Write an enzyme that holds these catalytic residues in place. Structure first.
Site, PDB file in Angstrom:
ATOM      1  CG  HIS A 111      -0.554   0.290   2.522  1.00 33.05           C
ATOM      2  ND1 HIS A 111      -0.253  -0.700   3.433  1.00 33.05           N
ATOM      3  CD2 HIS A 111      -0.354   1.464   3.170  1.00 33.05           C
ATOM      4  CE1 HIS A 111       0.115  -0.150   4.577  1.00 33.05           C
ATOM      5  NE2 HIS A 111       0.062   1.162   4.445  1.00 33.05           N
ATOM      6  CG  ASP A 138       0.036  -4.145   2.823  1.00 34.35           C
ATOM      7  OD1 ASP A 138       0.154  -3.686   1.664  1.00 34.35           O
ATOM      8  OD2 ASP A 138      -0.061  -3.440   3.846  1.00 34.35           O
ATOM      9  N   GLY A 197       2.301   6.556   9.011  1.00 38.00           N
ATOM     10  CA  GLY A 197       3.666   6.965   8.706  1.00 38.00           C
ATOM     11  C   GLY A 197       4.640   5.837   9.032  1.00 38.00           C
ATOM     12  CB  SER A 239       2.533   1.814   6.227  1.00 35.26           C
ATOM     13  OG  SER A 239       1.203   1.550   6.637  1.00 35.26           O
ATOM     14  N   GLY A 240       5.037  -0.266   6.130  1.00 38.50           N
ATOM     15  CA  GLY A 240       6.219  -0.729   5.417  1.00 38.50           C
ATOM     16  C   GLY A 240       7.403  -1.000   6.332  1.00 38.50           C
TER      17      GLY A 240
END
Ligand SMILES: [Ca+2]
Lengths: 222, 58
Positions: free
Chosen positions: A40, A84, A174, A176-177
Protein backbone atom coordinates in the site's frame (compact mmCIF):
# COMPACT_ATOMS: atom_id res chain seq x y z
CA UNK A 1 4.93 4.91 16.90
CA UNK A 2 2.64 5.48 19.92
CA UNK A 3 3.83 4.73 23.45
CA UNK A 4 7.37 3.78 22.36
CA UNK A 5 10.73 5.40 23.01
CA UNK A 6 13.39 7.09 20.88
CA UNK A 7 15.75 4.46 19.45
CA UNK A 8 19.46 4.72 20.19
CA UNK A 9 20.76 6.32 16.98
CA UNK A 10 21.52 3.73 14.37
CA UNK A 11 20.33 0.83 16.52
CA UNK A 12 17.94 -0.20 13.67
CA UNK A 13 20.42 -0.01 10.74
CA UNK A 14 17.98 -1.73 8.39
CA UNK A 15 15.37 0.97 8.90
CA UNK A 16 14.73 3.10 5.79
CA UNK A 17 12.48 6.06 4.97
CA UNK A 18 10.49 6.13 1.74
CA UNK A 19 10.49 9.68 0.44
CA UNK A 20 8.57 11.27 -2.39
CA UNK A 21 8.53 14.92 -1.38
CA UNK A 22 8.31 13.94 2.29
CA UNK A 23 8.41 10.80 4.45
CA UNK A 24 5.35 8.69 3.68
CA UNK A 25 6.34 5.12 4.58
CA UNK A 26 9.07 3.04 6.15
CA UNK A 27 10.93 0.02 4.79
CA UNK A 28 13.59 -2.56 5.62
CA UNK A 29 16.96 -3.04 3.86
CA UNK A 30 17.26 -6.79 3.39
CA UNK A 31 20.45 -6.56 1.30
CA UNK A 32 22.63 -3.94 -0.42
CA UNK A 33 20.19 -3.90 -3.35
CA UNK A 34 16.72 -4.55 -1.95
CA UNK A 35 14.23 -3.06 0.46
CA UNK A 36 11.01 -4.65 1.76
CA UNK A 37 7.96 -2.45 2.45
CA UNK A 38 4.15 -2.65 2.30
CA UNK A 39 2.26 -2.91 -1.01
CA UNK A 40 0.00 0.00 0.00
CA UNK A 41 3.13 2.24 0.04
CA UNK A 42 3.58 1.66 -3.66
CA UNK A 43 4.80 4.36 -6.03
CA UNK A 44 6.39 3.76 -9.45
CA UNK A 45 9.53 5.67 -8.36
CA UNK A 46 10.56 6.44 -4.77
CA UNK A 47 13.72 7.68 -3.05
CA UNK A 48 15.02 5.46 -0.24
CA UNK A 49 16.84 7.17 2.63
CA UNK A 50 19.22 5.08 4.68
CA UNK A 51 21.40 5.87 7.67
CA UNK A 52 18.76 8.14 9.16
CA UNK A 53 17.88 8.97 12.72
CA UNK A 54 16.28 12.44 12.59
CA UNK A 55 14.76 12.66 9.13
CA UNK A 56 14.59 16.46 9.29
CA UNK A 57 18.22 17.10 10.02
CA UNK A 58 21.33 16.28 7.92
CA UNK A 59 23.51 13.98 10.02
CA UNK A 60 26.25 12.92 7.61
CA UNK A 61 25.28 9.27 8.03
CA UNK A 62 22.62 9.15 5.30
CA UNK A 63 22.33 7.75 1.78
CA UNK A 64 19.57 8.82 -0.64
CA UNK A 65 19.20 6.12 -3.28
CA UNK A 66 16.52 6.17 -5.91
CA UNK A 67 14.64 3.00 -6.73
CA UNK A 68 15.01 1.38 -10.13
CA UNK A 69 12.22 -1.16 -9.58
CA UNK A 70 9.21 -1.38 -7.27
CA UNK A 71 7.49 -4.79 -7.29
CA UNK A 72 4.23 -5.34 -5.37
CA UNK A 73 3.29 -8.84 -4.32
CA UNK A 74 1.22 -10.19 -7.24
CA UNK A 75 -1.67 -11.26 -5.05
CA UNK A 76 -1.99 -8.02 -3.07
CA UNK A 77 -5.59 -6.89 -2.51
CA UNK A 78 -6.11 -3.30 -1.33
CA UNK A 79 -9.65 -3.78 0.01
CA UNK A 80 -8.66 -6.78 2.14
CA UNK A 81 -5.22 -5.31 2.73
CA UNK A 82 -4.13 -8.84 1.90
CA UNK A 83 -0.55 -9.80 0.85
CA UNK A 84 0.62 -6.37 1.81
CA UNK A 85 4.25 -6.68 0.81
CA UNK A 86 6.48 -5.28 -1.89
CA UNK A 87 10.13 -5.11 -2.90
CA UNK A 88 12.07 -2.06 -4.04
CA UNK A 89 15.30 -2.46 -6.07
CA UNK A 90 17.91 0.24 -5.28
CA UNK A 91 19.30 1.98 -8.42
CA UNK A 92 22.75 1.87 -6.84
CA UNK A 93 23.60 -0.59 -4.05
CA UNK A 94 23.66 0.69 -0.49
CA UNK A 95 27.02 1.08 1.21
CA UNK A 96 26.83 -1.11 4.30
CA UNK A 97 28.57 0.44 7.29
CA UNK A 98 28.08 1.40 10.94
CA UNK A 99 24.77 3.09 9.96
CA UNK A 100 23.50 1.03 7.07
CA UNK A 101 23.25 -2.71 7.61
CA UNK A 102 20.60 -5.20 6.39
CA UNK A 103 18.11 -7.29 8.43
CA UNK A 104 17.84 -11.06 8.09
CA UNK A 105 14.79 -12.67 6.52
CA UNK A 106 12.90 -15.12 8.79
CA UNK A 107 14.08 -18.72 8.82
CA UNK A 108 10.89 -19.75 10.66
CA UNK A 109 7.61 -18.08 11.54
CA UNK A 110 7.67 -16.62 15.06
CA UNK A 111 5.17 -17.92 17.67
CA UNK A 112 2.58 -15.95 19.61
CA UNK A 113 4.22 -14.56 22.71
CA UNK A 114 7.47 -13.73 20.89
CA UNK A 115 8.69 -10.25 21.91
CA UNK A 116 9.61 -8.00 19.01
CA UNK A 117 10.64 -4.47 18.16
CA UNK A 118 8.89 -2.18 15.70
CA UNK A 119 10.21 1.25 14.71
CA UNK A 120 9.30 4.20 12.50
CA UNK A 121 8.75 7.91 12.07
CA UNK A 122 4.97 7.72 12.14
CA UNK A 123 2.48 9.54 14.36
CA UNK A 124 3.37 9.29 18.09
CA UNK A 125 0.08 10.83 19.29
CA UNK A 126 2.12 12.87 21.80
CA UNK A 127 3.40 16.43 21.94
CA UNK A 128 6.58 15.21 23.67
CA UNK A 129 7.56 12.27 21.45
CA UNK A 130 9.14 13.73 18.31
CA UNK A 131 8.25 11.60 15.28
CA UNK A 132 11.22 12.99 13.32
CA UNK A 133 13.49 11.08 15.64
CA UNK A 134 13.24 7.33 15.06
CA UNK A 135 10.91 5.71 17.63
CA UNK A 136 11.20 2.16 18.93
CA UNK A 137 8.63 -0.04 20.67
CA UNK A 138 8.64 -3.59 22.04
CA UNK A 139 5.52 -5.56 21.19
CA UNK A 140 4.58 -9.23 21.68
CA UNK A 141 3.06 -11.27 18.88
CA UNK A 142 -0.58 -12.07 19.71
CA UNK A 143 -2.35 -15.38 19.17
CA UNK A 144 -4.43 -15.78 16.01
CA UNK A 145 -7.41 -16.28 18.28
CA UNK A 146 -7.10 -12.83 19.85
CA UNK A 147 -6.22 -11.38 16.48
CA UNK A 148 -9.31 -12.83 14.74
CA UNK A 149 -11.53 -11.85 17.66
CA UNK A 150 -10.37 -8.17 17.37
CA UNK A 151 -11.05 -8.11 13.64
CA UNK A 152 -13.63 -10.93 12.89
CA UNK A 153 -12.94 -12.49 9.52
CA UNK A 154 -10.36 -9.88 8.47
CA UNK A 155 -7.24 -11.87 9.35
CA UNK A 156 -5.69 -13.91 6.54
CA UNK A 157 -2.63 -16.16 6.54
CA UNK A 158 -0.58 -13.22 5.34
CA UNK A 159 -1.29 -11.43 8.65
CA UNK A 160 -0.62 -11.52 12.38
CA UNK A 161 -1.45 -9.13 15.20
CA UNK A 162 1.09 -7.76 17.62
CA UNK A 163 0.68 -5.22 20.39
CA UNK A 164 -1.53 -4.90 23.47
CA UNK A 165 -5.23 -5.52 23.65
CA UNK A 166 -5.23 -2.92 26.40
CA UNK A 167 -4.00 -0.36 23.82
CA UNK A 168 -1.56 2.48 24.48
CA UNK A 169 1.34 1.23 22.37
CA UNK A 170 1.12 0.63 18.63
CA UNK A 171 2.44 1.57 15.22
CA UNK A 172 0.47 4.46 13.53
CA UNK A 173 0.21 6.50 10.26
CA UNK A 174 3.67 6.96 8.71
CA UNK A 175 4.95 3.63 10.06
CA UNK A 176 3.60 1.39 7.25
CA UNK A 177 6.22 -0.73 5.42
CA UNK A 178 8.42 -0.54 8.50
CA UNK A 179 9.98 -3.43 10.41
CA UNK A 180 8.83 -5.82 13.15
CA UNK A 181 12.07 -7.54 14.15
CA UNK A 182 11.90 -10.52 16.48
CA UNK A 183 15.32 -11.85 17.49
CA UNK A 184 17.28 -10.45 14.58
CA UNK A 185 14.81 -11.61 11.98
CA UNK A 186 12.32 -9.56 10.01
CA UNK A 187 9.01 -11.16 11.05
CA UNK A 188 6.59 -8.55 9.80
CA UNK A 189 5.88 -5.35 7.90
CA UNK A 190 3.67 -2.60 9.45
CA UNK A 191 0.36 -2.80 7.61
CA UNK A 192 -2.92 -1.70 9.24
CA UNK A 193 -5.26 -1.52 12.22
CA UNK A 194 -8.30 0.41 13.46
CA UNK A 195 -6.92 3.65 14.83
CA UNK A 196 -3.71 3.55 16.80
CA UNK A 197 -3.18 2.26 20.32
CA UNK A 198 -6.91 1.77 20.88
CA UNK A 199 -7.96 -0.92 23.37
CA UNK A 200 -9.15 -4.01 21.53
CA UNK A 201 -7.57 -2.90 18.25
CA UNK A 202 -3.97 -4.16 18.06
CA UNK A 203 -1.81 -3.54 15.01
CA UNK A 204 -1.90 -6.00 12.13
CA UNK A 205 1.36 -6.83 10.30
CA UNK A 206 2.07 -8.63 7.03
CA UNK A 207 3.53 -12.14 7.77
CA UNK A 208 6.97 -12.16 6.14
CA UNK A 209 7.83 -15.87 6.73
CA UNK A 210 4.98 -17.00 4.49
CA UNK A 211 6.66 -14.97 1.70
CA UNK A 212 10.24 -16.31 1.79
CA UNK A 213 9.79 -17.99 -1.58
CA UNK A 214 8.52 -14.94 -3.44
CA UNK A 215 11.03 -12.72 -1.73
CA UNK A 216 14.01 -14.82 -2.75
CA UNK A 217 12.79 -15.72 -6.25
CA UNK A 218 12.05 -12.04 -7.00
CA UNK A 219 15.42 -10.75 -5.79
CA UNK A 220 16.99 -13.25 -8.21
CA UNK A 221 14.93 -12.36 -11.29
CA UNK A 222 17.34 -9.67 -12.54
CA UNK B 1 -21.77 20.07 -5.29
CA UNK B 2 -21.89 16.26 -4.96
CA UNK B 3 -23.08 15.19 -1.51
CA UNK B 4 -19.86 13.30 -0.89
CA UNK B 5 -18.22 16.75 -0.51
CA UNK B 6 -19.88 17.01 2.90
CA UNK B 7 -18.44 13.82 4.40
CA UNK B 8 -15.50 14.00 6.87
CA UNK B 9 -12.09 13.01 5.53
CA UNK B 10 -11.36 9.33 6.13
CA UNK B 11 -7.82 8.18 7.01
CA UNK B 12 -8.67 4.49 6.70
CA UNK B 13 -6.96 1.48 8.37
CA UNK B 14 -3.62 1.45 6.54
CA UNK B 15 -0.66 3.16 8.15
CA UNK B 16 1.01 5.21 5.50
CA UNK B 17 1.25 9.02 5.64
CA UNK B 18 -0.06 10.19 2.28
CA UNK B 19 -1.11 13.86 2.14
CA UNK B 20 -4.43 14.30 0.36
CA UNK B 21 -7.08 17.00 -0.02
CA UNK B 22 -10.70 16.96 1.05
CA UNK B 23 -13.48 19.51 0.91
CA UNK B 24 -14.17 21.11 4.28
CA UNK B 25 -17.74 22.29 3.98
CA UNK B 26 -17.79 23.98 7.42
CA UNK B 27 -15.04 26.36 6.29
CA UNK B 28 -15.82 26.03 2.61
CA UNK B 29 -12.15 25.25 1.87
CA UNK B 30 -10.28 22.36 0.33
CA UNK B 31 -7.75 21.25 2.94
CA UNK B 32 -5.16 18.54 3.47
CA UNK B 33 -5.46 15.45 5.64
CA UNK B 34 -3.43 12.31 6.24
CA UNK B 35 -4.72 9.37 4.22
CA UNK B 36 -3.55 5.91 5.34
CA UNK B 37 -3.18 4.37 1.89
CA UNK B 38 -6.16 2.01 1.50
CA UNK B 39 -9.96 2.14 1.44
CA UNK B 40 -10.22 5.76 0.38
CA UNK B 41 -13.63 7.40 0.32
CA UNK B 42 -14.77 9.95 -2.22
CA UNK B 43 -13.93 13.19 -0.44
CA UNK B 44 -10.23 12.38 -1.06
CA UNK B 45 -8.40 14.20 -3.92
CA UNK B 46 -4.82 14.15 -5.21
CA UNK B 47 -4.64 17.89 -5.60
CA UNK B 48 -6.32 21.09 -4.51
CA UNK B 49 -7.39 21.70 -8.10
CA UNK B 50 -9.29 18.37 -8.33
CA UNK B 51 -10.87 19.08 -5.01
CA UNK B 52 -11.86 22.57 -6.16
CA UNK B 53 -13.17 21.55 -9.57
CA UNK B 54 -15.23 18.82 -7.88
CA UNK B 55 -16.46 20.18 -4.57
CA UNK B 56 -15.63 23.86 -4.97
CA UNK B 57 -19.28 24.80 -5.42
CA UNK B 58 -22.60 24.65 -7.24
CA1 LIG C 1 19.03 12.72 9.15
Amino acid sequence: IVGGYECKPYSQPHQVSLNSGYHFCGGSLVNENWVVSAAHCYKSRVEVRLGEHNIKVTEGSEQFISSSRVIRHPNYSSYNIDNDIMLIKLSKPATLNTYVQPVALPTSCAPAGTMCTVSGWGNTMSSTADSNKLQCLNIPILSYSDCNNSYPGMITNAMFCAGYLEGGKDSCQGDSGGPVVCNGELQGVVSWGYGCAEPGNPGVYAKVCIFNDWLTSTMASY
Amino acid sequence: RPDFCLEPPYTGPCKARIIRYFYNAKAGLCQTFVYGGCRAKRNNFKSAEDCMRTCGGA
